[PDB]
Amino acid sequence: SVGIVYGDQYRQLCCSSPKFGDRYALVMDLINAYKLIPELSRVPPLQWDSPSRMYEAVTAFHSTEYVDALKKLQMLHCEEKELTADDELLMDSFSLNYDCPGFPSVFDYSLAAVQGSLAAASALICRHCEVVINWGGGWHHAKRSEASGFCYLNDIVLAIHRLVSSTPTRVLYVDLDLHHGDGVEEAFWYSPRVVTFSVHHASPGFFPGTGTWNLPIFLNGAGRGRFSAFNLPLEEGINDLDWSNAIGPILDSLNIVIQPSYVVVQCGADCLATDPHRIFRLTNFYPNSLSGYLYAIKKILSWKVPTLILGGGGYNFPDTARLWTRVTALTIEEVKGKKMTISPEIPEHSYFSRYGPDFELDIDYFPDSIQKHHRRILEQLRNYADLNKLIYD
Numbered sequence: 443s444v445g446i447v448y449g450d451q452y453r454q455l456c457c458s459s460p461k462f463g464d465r466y467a468l469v470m471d472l473i474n475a476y477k478l479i480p481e482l483s484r485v486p487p488l489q490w491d492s493p494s495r496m497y498e499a500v501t502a503f504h505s506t507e508y509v510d511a512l513k514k515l516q517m518l519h520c521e522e523k524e525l526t527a528d529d530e531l532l533m534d535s536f537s538l539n540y541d542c543p544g545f546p547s548v549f550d551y552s553l554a555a556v557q558g559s560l561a562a563a564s565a566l567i568c569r570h571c572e573v574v575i576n577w578g579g580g581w582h583h584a585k586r587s588e589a590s591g592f593c594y595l596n597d598i599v600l601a602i603h604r605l606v607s608s609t610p611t612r613v614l615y616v617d618l619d620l621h622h623g624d625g626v627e628e629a630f631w632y633s634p635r636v637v638t639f640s641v642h643h644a645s646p647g648f649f650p651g652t653g654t655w656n657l658p659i660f661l662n663g664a665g666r667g668r669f670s671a672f673n674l675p676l677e678e679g680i681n682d683l684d685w686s687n688a689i690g691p692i693l694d695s696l697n698i699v700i701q702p703s704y705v706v707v708q709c710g711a712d713c714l715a716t717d718p719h720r721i722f723r724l725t726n727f728y729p730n731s732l733s734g735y736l737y738a739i740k741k742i743l744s745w746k747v748p749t750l751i752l753g754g755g756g757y758n759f760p761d762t763a764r765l766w767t768r769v770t771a772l773t774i775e776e777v778k779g780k781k782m783t784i785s786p787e788i789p790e791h792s793y794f795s796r797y798g799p800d801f802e803l804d805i806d807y808f809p810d811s812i813q814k815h816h817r818r819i820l821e822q823l824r825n826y827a828d829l830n831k832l833i834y835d
Protein backbone atom coordinates (compact mmCIF):
# COMPACT_ATOMS: atom_id res chain seq x y z
CA SER A 443 0.00 0.00 0.00
CA VAL A 444 1.02 3.65 -0.65
CA GLY A 445 0.22 6.00 2.23
CA ILE A 446 -0.40 9.76 2.18
CA VAL A 447 -0.51 11.97 5.29
CA TYR A 448 -3.67 14.12 5.52
CA GLY A 449 -6.51 15.38 7.71
CA ASP A 450 -8.80 18.40 8.15
CA GLN A 451 -6.98 19.86 11.19
CA TYR A 452 -3.62 18.91 9.46
CA ARG A 453 -4.66 20.86 6.30
CA GLN A 454 -5.67 24.01 8.32
CA LEU A 455 -2.32 23.88 10.26
CA CYS A 456 -0.19 23.25 7.07
CA CYS A 457 -1.95 26.26 5.39
CA SER A 458 -1.56 28.65 8.39
CA SER A 459 1.98 30.06 7.69
CA PRO A 460 2.62 33.42 5.87
CA LYS A 461 5.52 31.98 3.75
CA PHE A 462 3.81 28.82 2.32
CA GLY A 463 0.24 30.21 2.49
CA ASP A 464 -2.23 27.68 0.95
CA ARG A 465 0.43 25.61 -0.99
CA TYR A 466 -0.53 22.34 0.82
CA ALA A 467 -4.28 22.89 0.00
CA LEU A 468 -3.31 23.18 -3.74
CA VAL A 469 -1.10 20.00 -3.68
CA MET A 470 -3.80 17.81 -1.97
CA ASP A 471 -6.65 19.31 -4.09
CA LEU A 472 -4.81 18.59 -7.38
CA ILE A 473 -4.13 14.98 -6.19
CA ASN A 474 -7.88 14.65 -5.31
CA ALA A 475 -9.07 16.36 -8.63
CA TYR A 476 -6.99 13.72 -10.53
CA LYS A 477 -8.85 10.94 -8.55
CA LEU A 478 -5.60 9.71 -6.86
CA ILE A 479 -7.01 9.74 -3.24
CA PRO A 480 -9.05 6.41 -3.62
CA GLU A 481 -5.75 4.68 -4.66
CA LEU A 482 -3.96 5.88 -1.47
CA SER A 483 -4.07 4.84 2.21
CA ARG A 484 -4.87 7.84 4.50
CA VAL A 485 -2.14 8.15 7.21
CA PRO A 486 -3.52 10.32 10.09
CA PRO A 487 -1.03 12.67 11.87
CA LEU A 488 0.35 11.43 15.24
CA GLN A 489 -1.28 12.79 18.41
CA TRP A 490 -0.01 12.47 22.01
CA ASP A 491 -1.65 11.60 25.36
CA SER A 492 -0.14 14.65 27.13
CA PRO A 493 2.17 17.74 26.81
CA SER A 494 4.95 15.61 28.51
CA ARG A 495 4.73 12.88 25.81
CA MET A 496 4.82 15.52 23.00
CA TYR A 497 7.87 17.21 24.66
CA GLU A 498 9.63 13.78 24.93
CA ALA A 499 9.05 13.14 21.18
CA VAL A 500 10.31 16.58 20.03
CA THR A 501 13.27 16.64 22.53
CA ALA A 502 14.59 13.39 21.00
CA PHE A 503 16.37 15.99 18.69
CA HIS A 504 15.56 19.60 19.83
CA SER A 505 16.56 21.14 23.18
CA THR A 506 13.79 21.70 25.78
CA GLU A 507 14.79 25.42 25.92
CA TYR A 508 14.28 25.84 22.15
CA VAL A 509 10.87 24.01 22.23
CA ASP A 510 9.87 26.26 25.22
CA ALA A 511 10.94 29.42 23.27
CA LEU A 512 8.98 28.26 20.17
CA LYS A 513 5.80 27.63 22.30
CA LYS A 514 6.26 31.09 24.02
CA LEU A 515 6.62 32.75 20.54
CA GLN A 516 3.15 31.35 19.57
CA MET A 517 1.55 32.66 22.85
CA LEU A 518 3.15 36.13 22.30
CA HIS A 519 1.81 36.30 18.73
CA CYS A 520 -1.80 35.59 19.95
CA GLU A 521 -1.71 39.10 21.64
CA GLU A 522 -1.70 42.60 20.03
CA LYS A 523 1.04 43.93 22.44
CA GLU A 524 4.67 44.21 21.18
CA LEU A 525 7.34 41.75 22.51
CA THR A 526 9.51 43.11 25.40
CA ALA A 527 13.27 43.75 24.83
CA ASP A 528 14.02 40.57 26.92
CA ASP A 529 11.61 38.46 24.81
CA GLU A 530 13.13 39.79 21.53
CA LEU A 531 16.62 38.74 22.90
CA LEU A 532 15.37 35.28 23.91
CA MET A 533 13.92 34.69 20.36
CA ASP A 534 17.16 36.03 18.71
CA SER A 535 19.27 33.47 20.76
CA PHE A 536 17.30 30.67 18.91
CA SER A 537 17.10 32.56 15.50
CA LEU A 538 13.29 32.89 15.89
CA ASN A 539 13.50 36.04 13.71
CA TYR A 540 14.02 37.31 10.11
CA ASP A 541 13.35 34.30 7.80
CA CYS A 542 11.74 32.40 10.75
CA PRO A 543 9.41 34.96 12.45
CA GLY A 544 6.52 34.40 14.83
CA PHE A 545 2.88 34.27 13.72
CA PRO A 546 -0.33 33.15 15.60
CA SER A 547 0.13 29.41 14.89
CA VAL A 548 3.97 29.05 14.54
CA PHE A 549 4.21 26.20 17.10
CA ASP A 550 1.06 24.29 15.93
CA TYR A 551 2.19 24.71 12.24
CA SER A 552 5.77 23.42 12.98
CA LEU A 553 4.57 20.51 15.20
CA ALA A 554 1.98 19.45 12.54
CA ALA A 555 4.85 18.34 10.14
CA VAL A 556 6.49 16.41 13.07
CA GLN A 557 3.09 14.70 13.81
CA GLY A 558 2.74 13.80 10.10
CA SER A 559 6.33 12.55 9.46
CA LEU A 560 6.40 10.47 12.70
CA ALA A 561 3.02 8.83 11.79
CA ALA A 562 4.44 8.22 8.27
CA ALA A 563 7.55 6.48 9.82
CA SER A 564 5.23 4.36 12.11
CA ALA A 565 3.14 3.14 9.12
CA LEU A 566 6.40 1.89 7.43
CA ILE A 567 7.67 0.24 10.70
CA CYS A 568 4.45 -1.88 11.14
CA ARG A 569 4.54 -2.71 7.36
CA HIS A 570 0.98 -1.23 6.78
CA CYS A 571 2.45 0.81 3.84
CA GLU A 572 5.37 0.07 1.46
CA VAL A 573 5.82 3.84 0.73
CA VAL A 574 4.39 6.88 2.66
CA ILE A 575 4.08 10.42 1.28
CA ASN A 576 4.03 13.62 3.44
CA TRP A 577 3.65 16.85 1.38
CA GLY A 578 3.38 18.87 4.62
CA GLY A 579 6.87 17.72 5.72
CA GLY A 580 10.53 17.92 4.66
CA TRP A 581 11.88 20.77 6.83
CA HIS A 582 15.63 19.94 6.43
CA HIS A 583 17.28 23.19 7.76
CA ALA A 584 16.02 23.20 11.41
CA LYS A 585 18.74 22.51 14.07
CA ARG A 586 18.73 21.27 17.73
CA SER A 587 18.37 24.83 19.17
CA GLU A 588 17.93 26.99 16.06
CA ALA A 589 15.23 27.83 13.46
CA SER A 590 16.68 28.06 9.93
CA GLY A 591 15.49 28.86 6.38
CA PHE A 592 11.71 28.68 7.14
CA CYS A 593 12.18 25.46 9.18
CA TYR A 594 11.32 25.57 12.91
CA LEU A 595 11.21 21.84 13.80
CA ASN A 596 13.17 19.13 11.99
CA ASP A 597 10.46 16.57 11.06
CA ILE A 598 12.95 14.60 8.89
CA VAL A 599 15.50 13.99 11.75
CA LEU A 600 12.68 12.90 14.12
CA ALA A 601 11.19 10.53 11.45
CA ILE A 602 14.71 9.04 10.70
CA HIS A 603 15.42 8.68 14.47
CA ARG A 604 12.12 6.69 14.84
CA LEU A 605 13.23 4.46 11.87
CA VAL A 606 16.84 3.81 13.11
CA SER A 607 15.62 2.87 16.62
CA SER A 608 12.72 0.56 15.38
CA THR A 609 14.51 -2.84 15.82
CA PRO A 610 15.71 -4.04 19.33
CA THR A 611 19.05 -0.94 10.94
CA ARG A 612 20.48 1.51 8.33
CA VAL A 613 18.69 4.52 6.74
CA LEU A 614 19.67 6.24 3.44
CA TYR A 615 18.57 9.90 3.31
CA VAL A 616 18.29 11.43 -0.20
CA ASP A 617 17.88 15.26 -0.35
CA LEU A 618 16.62 16.54 -3.76
CA ASP A 619 15.88 20.15 -2.71
CA LEU A 620 17.80 23.05 -4.41
CA HIS A 621 19.38 23.93 -1.03
CA HIS A 622 21.88 21.89 0.94
CA GLY A 623 20.13 19.75 3.62
CA ASP A 624 22.40 20.93 6.48
CA GLY A 625 20.08 20.18 9.49
CA VAL A 626 19.71 16.45 8.66
CA GLU A 627 23.43 16.15 7.69
CA GLU A 628 24.52 17.75 11.01
CA ALA A 629 22.14 15.57 13.15
CA PHE A 630 23.68 12.34 11.78
CA TRP A 631 27.30 13.56 11.30
CA TYR A 632 28.61 11.18 14.07
CA SER A 633 26.33 8.23 13.07
CA PRO A 634 27.28 5.55 10.48
CA ARG A 635 23.75 4.00 10.59
CA VAL A 636 22.25 7.06 8.84
CA VAL A 637 23.89 7.86 5.49
CA THR A 638 22.92 11.31 4.10
CA PHE A 639 23.14 12.46 0.48
CA SER A 640 22.30 15.96 -0.77
CA VAL A 641 22.37 17.19 -4.36
CA HIS A 642 21.99 20.99 -4.50
CA HIS A 643 23.26 24.31 -5.81
CA ALA A 644 26.22 25.85 -3.92
CA SER A 645 27.86 29.21 -4.72
CA PRO A 646 29.20 32.20 -2.66
CA GLY A 647 26.41 33.88 -0.66
CA PHE A 648 23.82 31.21 -1.56
CA PHE A 649 21.92 29.59 1.38
CA PRO A 650 22.92 27.78 3.64
CA GLY A 651 26.60 27.93 2.53
CA THR A 652 27.51 24.27 3.24
CA GLY A 653 27.55 21.04 1.15
CA THR A 654 30.67 22.15 -0.78
CA TRP A 655 34.55 22.48 -0.55
CA ASN A 656 35.76 23.53 2.95
CA LEU A 657 44.01 22.43 -0.85
CA PRO A 658 40.17 22.50 -0.40
CA ILE A 659 38.48 19.26 0.75
CA PHE A 660 34.95 18.04 1.52
CA LEU A 661 34.12 17.33 5.20
CA ASN A 662 32.04 14.11 5.38
CA GLY A 663 31.30 13.07 8.98
CA ALA A 664 33.34 12.54 12.19
CA GLY A 665 34.00 9.83 14.81
CA ARG A 666 32.20 6.59 13.82
CA GLY A 667 30.24 8.62 11.22
CA ARG A 668 33.35 9.49 9.12
CA PHE A 669 32.54 9.23 5.35
CA SER A 670 28.75 8.95 6.07
CA ALA A 671 27.77 12.45 4.76
CA PHE A 672 27.67 12.70 0.93
CA ASN A 673 27.39 15.94 -1.08
CA LEU A 674 27.00 16.86 -4.78
CA PRO A 675 27.09 20.65 -5.52
CA LEU A 676 25.95 21.59 -9.04
CA GLU A 677 26.23 24.70 -11.27
CA GLU A 678 23.19 26.91 -12.04
CA GLY A 679 21.31 26.16 -15.28
CA ILE A 680 21.40 22.32 -15.06
CA ASN A 681 18.64 20.62 -17.11
CA ASP A 682 16.73 17.35 -16.35
CA LEU A 683 19.11 14.97 -18.24
CA ASP A 684 22.42 16.35 -16.89
CA TRP A 685 21.02 16.45 -13.31
CA SER A 686 19.73 12.85 -13.84
CA ASN A 687 23.15 11.66 -15.15
CA ALA A 688 24.98 13.37 -12.24
CA ILE A 689 22.86 11.61 -9.50
CA GLY A 690 21.79 8.28 -11.06
CA PRO A 691 25.05 6.29 -10.55
CA ILE A 692 25.57 7.80 -7.03
CA LEU A 693 22.03 6.69 -5.98
CA ASP A 694 22.55 3.15 -7.37
CA SER A 695 26.01 2.78 -5.72
CA LEU A 696 24.70 4.00 -2.27
CA ASN A 697 21.91 1.34 -2.38
CA ILE A 698 24.37 -1.49 -3.31
CA VAL A 699 26.92 -0.68 -0.55
CA ILE A 700 24.72 0.66 2.30
CA GLN A 701 21.79 -1.77 1.68
CA PRO A 702 19.37 0.50 3.65
CA SER A 703 16.40 -0.84 5.61
CA TYR A 704 14.60 2.51 4.87
CA VAL A 705 14.97 5.35 2.36
CA VAL A 706 13.85 8.93 3.24
CA VAL A 707 13.54 11.21 0.21
CA GLN A 708 13.20 14.99 0.62
CA CYS A 709 11.53 16.22 -2.60
CA GLY A 710 11.79 20.04 -2.52
CA ALA A 711 10.34 21.60 -5.74
CA ASP A 712 12.73 24.59 -5.84
CA CYS A 713 14.87 23.01 -8.67
CA LEU A 714 11.95 23.51 -11.15
CA ALA A 715 12.78 25.91 -14.04
CA THR A 716 9.65 27.95 -13.07
CA ASP A 717 10.58 28.39 -9.35
CA PRO A 718 11.17 32.11 -8.37
CA HIS A 719 14.80 31.07 -7.47
CA ARG A 720 15.50 30.38 -11.23
CA ILE A 721 18.67 28.31 -10.49
CA PHE A 722 18.15 24.80 -11.96
CA ARG A 723 16.05 23.95 -15.08
CA LEU A 724 14.29 20.76 -13.91
CA THR A 725 10.72 20.00 -15.15
CA ASN A 726 7.80 17.72 -14.13
CA PHE A 727 7.69 16.20 -17.69
CA TYR A 728 6.86 12.48 -18.03
CA PRO A 729 7.43 10.94 -21.54
CA ASN A 730 5.38 7.80 -22.40
CA SER A 731 12.98 15.57 -21.47
CA LEU A 732 12.15 13.29 -18.51
CA SER A 733 11.77 15.14 -15.13
CA GLY A 734 14.85 14.85 -12.89
CA TYR A 735 12.54 14.32 -9.87
CA LEU A 736 10.53 11.56 -11.67
CA TYR A 737 13.78 9.79 -12.82
CA ALA A 738 15.24 9.73 -9.24
CA ILE A 739 11.95 8.76 -7.51
CA LYS A 740 11.55 5.82 -10.03
CA LYS A 741 15.16 4.62 -9.45
CA ILE A 742 14.75 4.82 -5.58
CA LEU A 743 11.35 2.97 -5.80
CA SER A 744 12.92 0.22 -8.03
CA TRP A 745 15.04 -0.95 -5.05
CA LYS A 746 11.86 -2.17 -3.30
CA VAL A 747 12.99 -0.64 0.07
CA PRO A 748 10.27 0.89 2.44
CA THR A 749 10.44 4.61 1.52
CA LEU A 750 9.32 7.90 3.06
CA ILE A 751 8.62 10.72 0.49
CA LEU A 752 8.54 14.31 1.86
CA GLY A 753 7.97 17.83 0.52
CA GLY A 754 10.15 20.81 1.34
CA GLY A 755 11.00 23.85 -0.78
CA GLY A 756 8.85 25.02 -3.70
CA TYR A 757 7.88 28.71 -4.13
CA ASN A 758 5.72 28.51 -7.30
CA PHE A 759 2.67 26.87 -5.62
CA PRO A 760 0.69 25.62 -8.75
CA ASP A 761 3.95 24.27 -10.33
CA THR A 762 4.91 22.54 -7.02
CA ALA A 763 1.40 20.95 -7.08
CA ARG A 764 1.99 19.91 -10.78
CA LEU A 765 5.22 18.04 -9.84
CA TRP A 766 4.06 16.49 -6.50
CA THR A 767 0.82 15.25 -8.16
CA ARG A 768 3.02 13.47 -10.78
CA VAL A 769 5.33 12.06 -8.01
CA THR A 770 2.19 10.71 -6.21
CA ALA A 771 0.84 8.99 -9.43
CA LEU A 772 4.32 7.52 -10.31
CA THR A 773 4.62 6.12 -6.73
CA ILE A 774 1.22 4.37 -7.13
CA GLU A 775 2.30 2.98 -10.58
CA GLU A 776 5.72 1.77 -9.30
CA VAL A 777 4.45 0.17 -6.04
CA LYS A 778 1.00 -1.27 -7.05
CA GLY A 779 1.87 -2.04 -10.72
CA LYS A 780 -1.39 -0.26 -11.65
CA LYS A 781 -1.24 2.26 -14.55
CA MET A 782 -2.26 5.79 -13.48
CA THR A 783 -3.49 7.64 -16.57
CA ILE A 784 -3.30 11.39 -15.90
CA SER A 785 -4.94 13.81 -18.43
CA PRO A 786 -2.54 16.55 -19.75
CA GLU A 787 -5.25 19.14 -18.89
CA ILE A 788 -5.99 20.36 -15.31
CA PRO A 789 -9.38 18.93 -14.10
CA GLU A 790 -12.00 21.31 -12.71
CA HIS A 791 -11.70 21.81 -8.91
CA SER A 792 -11.85 24.67 -6.31
CA TYR A 793 -8.31 25.94 -7.28
CA PHE A 794 -8.66 25.59 -11.16
CA SER A 795 -8.12 29.40 -11.74
CA ARG A 796 -4.61 29.21 -10.12
CA TYR A 797 -3.37 27.00 -13.03
CA GLY A 798 -4.31 29.58 -15.71
CA PRO A 799 -4.06 30.74 -18.50
CA ASP A 800 -3.15 27.39 -20.22
CA PHE A 801 -4.54 24.93 -17.55
CA GLU A 802 -2.00 22.20 -18.53
CA LEU A 803 -0.36 19.64 -16.15
CA ASP A 804 3.11 20.22 -17.73
CA ILE A 805 4.92 23.28 -16.32
CA ASP A 806 5.01 26.18 -18.81
CA TYR A 807 8.71 26.00 -19.86
CA PHE A 808 10.67 25.31 -23.08
CA PRO A 809 14.34 24.16 -23.11
CA ASP A 810 34.12 17.08 -16.32
CA SER A 811 33.44 18.78 -12.89
CA ILE A 812 30.73 16.08 -12.36
CA GLN A 813 33.28 13.34 -13.31
CA LYS A 814 35.75 14.59 -10.64
CA HIS A 815 32.86 14.64 -8.07
CA HIS A 816 31.92 11.06 -9.15
CA ARG A 817 35.56 9.88 -8.57
CA ARG A 818 35.64 11.68 -5.14
CA ILE A 819 32.27 10.10 -4.08
CA LEU A 820 33.28 6.56 -5.26
CA GLU A 821 36.43 6.91 -3.03
CA GLN A 822 34.25 8.19 -0.06
CA LEU A 823 31.86 5.16 -0.36
CA ARG A 824 34.89 2.76 -0.45
CA ASN A 825 36.30 4.43 2.78
CA TYR A 826 32.77 4.26 4.32
CA ALA A 827 32.62 0.49 3.47
CA ASP A 828 36.24 -0.08 4.77
CA LEU A 829 35.55 1.75 8.11
CA ASN A 830 32.16 0.04 8.59
CA LYS A 831 33.46 -3.47 7.60
CA LEU A 832 30.86 -3.86 4.75
CA ILE A 833 31.31 -6.33 1.81
CA TYR A 834 31.35 -4.45 -1.54
CA ASP A 835 31.79 -5.28 -5.29
Ligand SMILES: C[C@H]1Sc2ccc(C(=O)NO)cc2NC1=O
Nearest residue numbers: 541591592619621649710755756
Ligand atom coordinates in the same frame (compact mmCIF):
# COMPACT_ATOMS: atom_id res chain seq x y z
C1 LIG B 1 15.85 34.48 2.10
C2 LIG B 1 16.81 33.59 1.38
S1 LIG B 1 17.29 32.35 2.42
C3 LIG B 1 16.51 30.87 2.11
C4 LIG B 1 16.51 29.88 3.07
C5 LIG B 1 15.90 28.61 2.79
C6 LIG B 1 15.22 28.37 1.51
C7 LIG B 1 14.64 27.02 1.24
O1 LIG B 1 13.64 26.90 0.55
N1 LIG B 1 15.31 25.83 1.71
O2 LIG B 1 14.86 24.62 1.49
C8 LIG B 1 15.20 29.41 0.52
C9 LIG B 1 15.84 30.62 0.76
N2 LIG B 1 15.81 31.77 -0.24
C10 LIG B 1 16.25 33.17 0.04
O3 LIG B 1 16.15 34.01 -0.84
Ligand SMILES: [K+]
Nearest residue numbers: 617619641642
Ligand atom coordinates in the same frame (compact mmCIF):
# COMPACT_ATOMS: atom_id res chain seq x y z
K1 LIG C 1 19.39 19.07 -1.53
Ligand SMILES: [K+]
Nearest residue numbers: 630633636670
Ligand atom coordinates in the same frame (compact mmCIF):
# COMPACT_ATOMS: atom_id res chain seq x y z
K1 LIG D 1 25.70 10.01 8.93
Ligand SMILES: [Zn+2]
Nearest residue numbers: 619621712755
Ligand atom coordinates in the same frame (compact mmCIF):
# COMPACT_ATOMS: atom_id res chain seq x y z
ZN1 LIG E 1 15.03 24.78 -0.87
